[PDB]
Design a protein around this ligand. Structure first.
Ligand SMILES: C/C=C(\C)CC/C=C(\C)CC/C=C(\C)CC/C(C)=C/CC/C(C)=C/CC/C(C)=C/C
Ligand SMILES: Nc1ncnc2c1ncn2[C@@H]1O[C@H](COP(=O)(O)OP(=O)(O)O)[C@@H](O)[C@H]1O
Ligand SMILES: Nc1ncnc2c1ncn2[C@@H]1O[C@H](COP(=O)(O)OP(=O)(O)O)[C@@H](O)[C@H]1O
Lengths: 132, 1033, 528
């Protein structure tokens, strides 16, 4: 009515893609920027992804000043496996095992099922996405 | 369905079809939903905000609103704090409109929806629609009462007060109205509309004493209405109430007034008389016609020409656009008035005419027009053709006012909002509850009126209290009531001048007018002291009428009777009868003691009174706390002065004419040899003209010697001098203008001017200074003693119109010069052979009894020459004269010519309706040139006879123009011939005999006239008629 | 009182299934019942079982001035009440109440039906003024005939007025009913306070009806999560709940209910009449749900559910979460005042300790979602919640005798075995200092409570223990196993130290207000 057109497309960093989102009554979790950006050589190197994940966790541990606890969804893709495919990259395993140990990226990390993290997360609700 | 689901249905319709359109900036809603028009009308936005508020009132019944109560309520505040903004920017105009209410000084009623700036100018649009300022105030009260906080600071309260000062004087400001055109004719003319005055009566009833801060409010946030100005609006609405105006005998704008939102009328018989005419003459299958002969968006209307030309209004008869909204108002009226079958009858009528938008949301088309191809078929059989909608919604066009009323009506009908919820201020008072509602109903109820006014006899001095006690009346001096301060009305007018004064918005304060008898009848708390005001009846004046004690006793009775008829506030009225030592001087003592004694008995004029000590009378009474005075700019409180104890010829020999042809210093010669204060006023009044304001007199400036002679004979009760003095010094009373409004508020029109001389017609409310030119310069240029007597009769007639309105029924144009003529004749008939007394020598009170006697229904006894001279001079018309003259014009092709005037069948039949007040004035204008008053009664009788012949005999119709003078001449000539055969009277062209003949009797006047009319009618075709088809033919 | 009237409503009392005294209550002057179905259930029984030709029987089996009643004996002896069945005196006044009820309730034909019934039974004084006889009794000679065919015999008036006897209450009701019926007074005029609320208007009347209406009840209680310490607010935020410490709401003062009970103790205190003030009882959940202005400050009170207590029930967080749900459900069912209720969920650092954290976070999270128990809630900052709300201004506190205002303390930020082996019976037959021996060899806080509870009896309140007065060691074991969630000990401890809760008495009244009777006592043992 007053010719306002939403929000400009801005890249959501780790901070934005660490809260859980309530979109149309179903919870949506979003992987970080560095995972879906597989258009340059950086994504092919699994060590790079480890390093990007470490940088994201270090940024999160320091810059999260939000109600809730941030939640990084880290899916292990087929490109994250080794050459044979029956084993996972060493770097990616090592990173995941360190996260399971509570520390990775200068940050204390709790790993667990995403269902457990609903009650202690920044479950923001996107009411503008409801139909009507 | 849950309430959430039931009301989500309305929120979808409100949000799509109303709140989508609300300006993001101003808050006002746009008149055109789709388009580049930027017009936001004031009335349509108010109705739109009311629609959102009605949904909020419904969502208040759900605790989990999901934000919808705040949004829908805050949308209403947005629209109402947006109309306030539009008005607040135009507050240079609110000041100008209070001082000079006029079509070109008004607050604009159409603004830019986007910016709030003025869009159309005074020439482009008729912005004087006081329905809008008045509905803004009714809705602001109804919404602030609901809990909606629209007024935020003291400056917004001062603007709402200044908006009130404007809405009070609506009775005297004619406007364009809800329909923006004025009358049925779009002549660019403003007229008083019951609808605009009715909404103003309602805004004023609602806003008197409303903390505009609501619950978060104090004494400094209250709005104060004038009980007297509100009365003047109540008086105007009731004297225009089965009707809407001089032009419209019914309009559908009366439905918004008589019932939601205002619920203004307080008479159940007028509500039914007004609604029944509106439903009967305006209802349609597709809606209610706005008014009969309406050209809005009619197929026959010219789009290019703004103004309909004379007789065009006929082309729109049966083609009238029908507005479906009026069905919604009738459904809201039914919910309020407990008729569960008027809601259904009109819901059933609306379900068919209601279009639906693409998403299913209902669209109330603004109007349903007859398509051009079908106009003649509708005109032939009205109600037969099918009319196309004006907006279907899918078009992108929505009537935002009608969309809002659907939400209000549908919610009210579905009981999702209550009548109480949308009328927080109780504008609808059910009959059983019409008892103690301020400004509307009094404890006694709607019908009973025996008010006991609380009189307090206050004496100017202790000397007078001790004198009055010896003679039987206990009075209290101003000092004996020490905490209570008795103030002249003018001191309250000074205090009120500080109400609404905002220097930021350039606003000034109450206009400086007189507070009247319904505002001096209140106890006020002004600056920490209790102030009771003496009535304006007790205010000293230059005019000579003050000297007659009998007129004071009558003004006291007249005021108390006004206070009884028109005081509907909670407390008993307080009338303070100030007694001045001058009032008891001489034989004024015996008349004053009888008034004072009746006030002690408890009845003076049918008005029961309780004289008692002011302290006891003021004790548990409601006091209006005037908190606006504060300290304001000056660190001192204003200085208010309060009444304080005043501690201790047979005929003029000099005739004007024979003594004015002389320019001599000899007039100054007789001045030394005239003991007559009437010869002196005539001699020392010739010289206020020829020698000048200060031509030296032996005594001193002439202006001082006439004021000495006027004042001296005023006391010596030498009334010829007092009237030559007043006239020569050109004295006008403050009350001439206030009374000329009684005539106007009551539908009467006053003409000032003598009989046989230049008359003038005050048809609209006018200023004291314009009225003064009309009486001393424009109308009376031959004798100015006439202006003093005419001023005397306007004061007398004005109270008679107010308290005994029917002594003036059958009178629409009150010709004061003609009424004075009737009185000079009554003095001659009463006088007998003995010379008739000079009306001018008669005392003001003797002139009032002569008037009251001439106005008394002429009874069997007087000569029919005297009955005729009095009735003709008073211009009394038999009941239905005006309706009967329509019937004569309808069955006369070429019209009626009387005294060189002509009522032609067209343009009048085409432009007017049978009971139109405009027609009564055209009949009165046609009979205007009848110089002789007895001839007017014979012409009024020919017209009454022509109506019986035409009505009794439906076959006969006039061929040529009816010359009423020729029909009268032929009747007198037959009478002349027949009486000659009896006794051969030799007087010729003397109609005295004819006038004396009784109307009905063996050979009376009515036979001669019937005969004449019948000879003329029978000289023309007799139309065979079907009501009683001929048996022998 | 609303709960009691409702529990007992179709009826009058344990004894009377209907009484005509219900008619003065259900309708003029009180107009008390707020349920239209109970009003009809109550009126219909009263009219059906109590109406008569000459009036309404006060109650069935009534012996007032009956012919069979003994004048000398004040008290009817058991089974006498049968002798008065059909002989019951019929009071014509109840016809006048039914006429007033009809004028109020818009039935223009219940006024006529009962006016028609009263015109015959109305005697007139010598000057023609109507006398409403108090009762119409069956004369003694006709008692058996009425009992055989009730409604057949003719009953003599009790007062004819000419006698010099007038029922002044009935004389007054004739004036009220006749004026109301003749429309010389209005229902609004004689019920200035609107006790009769017509159905269509039963919406926003305080203490009776709420915006939602008479039937709908989805109240949204205005929750405000208040945290004992900043530490707990920062901890709760990390886990998802924004709470506000008592200081963050600075102008607003959060008070224990007991501090309002102290303030109210100064209401109605007159020393001239010897009056003292509100009795010192607990304010409950419908009074701690209000915002109060006490001595110029805004006070919101934490509910009594959050009040610390000696009883061991407080330790179970699940019971706190349930008491929070139970309180909010009471606030929903029974709060009919204008504002939204304000529930303040005080969270104490003890509440989140250990695994109590997971249960508390789910309650706190549901309070954030807007529903806990079917009760919709709006958690928000107290300042926003208290903003346009109605505040009860407690102006009685004044300064009174002391030239100082009373001192009110407000919640402040707290700135930083498988089975008992020792059986009671085999270890109580022993009187030995050996119970004090095992006391040193019992790690069970249940064996200790059993061993150090035998001795609160046999050796005494202060028999010295290794630890100290026995009274101190059981209170240490009760408190210790209360935390270690060792519930056998907490119950042996509470019992041995004879612990009773403040709420036992307030709850035993729920049983009584609801028509239930509680028996305490074991199964197989003395009940009471
Ligand atoms: C207050 C004033 C009054 C009461 C009026 C007094 C009445 C008077 C003086 C007489 C009025 C007479 C009237 C209206 C008319 C008379 C008739 C009967 C006229 C008939 C004309 C005519 C030729 C009709 C045709 C007859 C047919 C149809 C034959 C088949
Ligand atoms: N001299 C007077 N006598 C009687 N009433 C008066 C007089 N002057 C003013 N009033 C009354 O005071 C009120 C307001 O005064 P004013 O503005 O002069 O009225 P209006 O415009 O109707 O003449 C009106 O009710 C009017 O009738
Ligand atoms: N400890 C408590 N636990 C639960 N409810 C309580 C408690 N103390 C008081 N109340 C409630 O507070 C209200 C008033 O308190 P009080 O006067 O003690 O009630 P009662 O007289 O019914 O015992 C009642 O609703 C009561 O049930």
């Amino acid at each position: 009515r007053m010719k306002l057109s939403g929000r400009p497309y801005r890249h959501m960093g780790v901070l934005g893609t660490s809260k859980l989102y309530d979109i149309r009554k179903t919870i949506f979790t979003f992987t970080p920027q560095f995972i879906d950006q597989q258009q340059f050589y950086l994504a092919l190197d699994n060590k790079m992804i480890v390093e990007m994940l470490r940088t994201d966790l270090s940024y999160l541990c320091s810059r999260w000043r939000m109600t809730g606890q941030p939640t990084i969804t880290f899916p292990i893709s087929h490109s994250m496996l080794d050459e044979d495919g029956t084993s996972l990259n060493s770097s990616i395993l090592a990173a995941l095992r360190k996260m399971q140990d509570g520390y990775f990226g200068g940050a204390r990390v709790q790993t667990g099922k995403l269902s457990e993290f609903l009650t202690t997360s920044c479950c923001t609700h996107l009411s503008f996405m409801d139909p009507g | 369905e849950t309430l959430w689901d039931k009301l989500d249905h309305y929120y979808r319709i409100v949000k799509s079809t109303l709140l989508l359109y609300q300006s993001p900036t101003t808050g006002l809603f746009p008149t055109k939903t789709c388009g580049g028009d930027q017009k936001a009308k004031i009335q349509d936005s108010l109705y739109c905000a009311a629609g959102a508020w009605a949904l909020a009132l419904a969502y208040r019944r759900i605790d989990d609103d999901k934000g919808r109560t705040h949004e829908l309520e805050h949308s209403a505040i947005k629209c109402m704090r947006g109309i306030l903004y539009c008005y607040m920017r135009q507050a240079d105009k609110v000041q100008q409109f209070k001082q000079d209410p006029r079509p070109t000084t008004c607050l604009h009623s159409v603004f830019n929806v986007h910016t709030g700036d003025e869009l159309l100018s005074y020439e482009e649009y008729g912005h004087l629609q006081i329905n809008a300022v008045s509905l803004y105030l009714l809705y602001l009260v109804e919404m602030i009462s609901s809990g909606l906080q629209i007024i935020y600071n003291t400056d917004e309260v001062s603007f709402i007060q200044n908006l009130v000062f404007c809405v009070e004087r609506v009775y005297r400001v004619p406007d364009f109205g809800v329909w923006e055109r004025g009358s049925k004719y779009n002549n660019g003319s403003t007229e008083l509309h019951s609808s605009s005055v009715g909404l103003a009566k309602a805004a004023l009833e609602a806003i008197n004493g409303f903390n505009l801060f609501g619950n978060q409010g104090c004494s400094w946030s209250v709005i104060f209405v004038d009980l007297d100005a509100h009365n003047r609006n109540r008086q105007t609405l009731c004297s225009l109430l089965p009707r809407e105006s001089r032009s419209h005998n019914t309009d559908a704008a009366l439905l918004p007034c008589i019932s939601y939102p205002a619920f203004a009328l307080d008479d159940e018989v007028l509500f039914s008389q007004t609604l029944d005419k509106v439903v009967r003459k305006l209802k349609g299958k597709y809606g209610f016609k706005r008014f009969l002969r309406d050209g809005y968006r009619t197929s026959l209307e010219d789009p290019n020409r703004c103004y309909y030309k004379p007789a065009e209004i006929k082309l729109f008869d049966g083609i009238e656009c029908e507005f479906p909204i009026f069905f919604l108002y009738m459904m809201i009226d039914g919910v309020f008035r407990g008729n569960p079958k008027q809601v259904q009858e009109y819901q059933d009528l609306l379900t068919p005419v209601l279009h639906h938008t693409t998403e299913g949301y209902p669209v109330v088309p603004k109007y349903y027009y007859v398509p051009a191809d079908f106009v003649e078929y509708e005109k032939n059989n009205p109600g037969s053709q099918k009319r196309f909608p004006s907006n279907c919604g899918r078009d992108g066009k929505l009537f935002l006012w009608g969309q809002a009323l659907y939400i209000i009506a549908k919610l009210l009908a579905d009981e999702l909002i209550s009548p109480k919820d949308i009328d927080p201020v109780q504008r609808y008072v059910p009959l059983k509850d019409q008892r103690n509602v301020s400004m509307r109903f009094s404890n006694q109820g709607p019908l009973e009126n025996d008010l006991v006014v609380h009189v307090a006899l206050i004496a100017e001095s202790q000397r007078l209290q001790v004198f009055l006690n010896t003679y039987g009346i206990q009075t209290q001096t101003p000092q004996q009531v020490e905490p209570i301060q008795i103030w002249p009305q003018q001191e309250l007018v000074k205090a009120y001048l500080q109400l609404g004064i905002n220097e930021k918005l350039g606003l000034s304060g109450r206009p400086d007018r007189p507070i009247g008898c319904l505002g001096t009848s209140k106890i006020y708390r002004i600056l920490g002291k209790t102030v009771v005001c003496y009535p304006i009846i007790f205010d000293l004046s230059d005019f000579y009428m003050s000297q007659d004690v009998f007129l004071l006793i009558d003004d006291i009775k007249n005021a108390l009777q006004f206070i009884k008829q028109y005081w509907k506030m909670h407390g008993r009225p307080l009338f303070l009868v100030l007694i001045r030592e001058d009032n008891i001087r001489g034989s004024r003592f015996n008349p004053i003691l009888d008034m004072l004694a009746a006030l002690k008995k408890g009845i003076i004029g049918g008005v029961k009174v309780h004289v008692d000590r002011l302290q006891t009378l003021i004790s548990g009474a409601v006091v209006e706390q005037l908190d606006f005075l504060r300290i304001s700019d000056t660190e001192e409180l204003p200085e208010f002065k309060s009444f304080e104890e005043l501690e201790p010829g047979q005929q003029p020999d000099v005739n004007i004419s024979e003594w004015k042809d002389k320019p001599t210093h000899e007039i100054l010669q007789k001045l030394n040899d005239c003991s007559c204060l009437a010869s002196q006023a005539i001699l020392l009044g010739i010289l206020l003209k020829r020698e000048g304001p200060n031509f030296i007199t032996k005594e001193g400036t002439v202006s001082d010697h006439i004021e000495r002679v006027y004042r001296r004979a005023g006391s010596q009760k030498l009334w010829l001098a007092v009237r030559y003095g007043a006239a020569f010094t050109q004295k006008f009373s403050s009350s001439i203008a206030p009374h000329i409004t009684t005539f106007l508020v009551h539908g009467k029109q006053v003409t000032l001017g003598a009989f046989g001389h230049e008359e003038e017609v005050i048809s609209n409310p006018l200023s004291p200074r314009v009225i003064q030119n009309i009486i001393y310069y424009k109308c009376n240029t031959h004798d100015e003693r006439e202006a003093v007597i005419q001023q005397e009769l306007v004061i007398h007639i004005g109270w008679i119109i107010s308290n005994n309105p029917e002594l003036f029924s059958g009178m629409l144009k009150i010709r004061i010069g003609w009424i004075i003529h009737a009185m000079e004749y009554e003095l001659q008939i009463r006088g007998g052979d003995k010379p008739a007394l000079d009306l001018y020598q008669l005392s003001p009170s003797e002139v009032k009894q002569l008037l009251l006697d001439i106005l008394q229904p002429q009874q069997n006894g007087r000569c029919w020459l005297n009955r005729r001279q009095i009735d003709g001079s008073l211009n009394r018309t038999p009941t239905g004269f005006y309706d009967r003259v329509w019937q004569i014009l309808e069955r006369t092709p070429n019209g009626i010519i009387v005294a060189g005037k002509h009522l032609p069948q067209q343009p009048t039949l085409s432009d007017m309706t049978m009971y139109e007040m405009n027609f009564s004035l055209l009949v009165e204008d046609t009979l205007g040139n009848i110089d002789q008053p007895q001839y007017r009664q014979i012409v009024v009788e020919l017209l009454m006879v022509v109506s019986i012949v035409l009505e009794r005999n439906p076959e006969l119709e006039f061929q040529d123009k009816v010359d009423l003078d020729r029909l009268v001449k032929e009747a007198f000539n037959e009478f002349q011939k027949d009486q000659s055969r009896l006794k051969e009277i030799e007087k010729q062209d003397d109609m005295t005999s004819f006038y004396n003949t009784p109307p009905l009797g063996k050979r009376g006047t009515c036979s001669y006239l019937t005969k004449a009319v019948m000879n003329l009618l029978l000289e023309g075709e007799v139309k065979p008629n079907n009501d009683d088809p001929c048996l022998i033919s």
